[PDB]
Amino acid sequence: SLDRICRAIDYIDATASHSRAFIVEVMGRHCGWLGLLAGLATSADYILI
């Protein structure tokens, strides 16, 4: 699951540009492990876990 998330973030990072923000809506109802680890692996700016 963590791999699927990072595969998407990697594709998002693989581009150019000012005034751009990107939201990755992650599946995982009870824990924040996926959010935290994806955030760590892809050096995300802000995580909502």
């Binding site: 699951s1 998407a8 923000a21 990107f22 939201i23 990755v24 809506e25 599946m27 909502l48």
Partner: protein
């Protein structure tokens, strides 16, 4: 979250939602190796049980 980025900051925000993508596909090497060994252990545990 989108409105904060679009209205409080001047950012054009594009949302990406994985959905079922996050449950589909083949298991990664770690999941295959570990799920397999766990299956083996689950059997032994069940047999060794008293």
């Amino acid at each position: 979250v989108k409105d904060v980025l679009v209205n409080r900051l001047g950012l054009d925000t594009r949302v990406t939602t994985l959905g079922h993508v996050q449950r589909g596909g083949t298991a990664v090497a770690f999941d295959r190796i570990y799920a397999t060994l766990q299956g083996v252990e689950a059997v032994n545990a069940v047999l060794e049980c008293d």
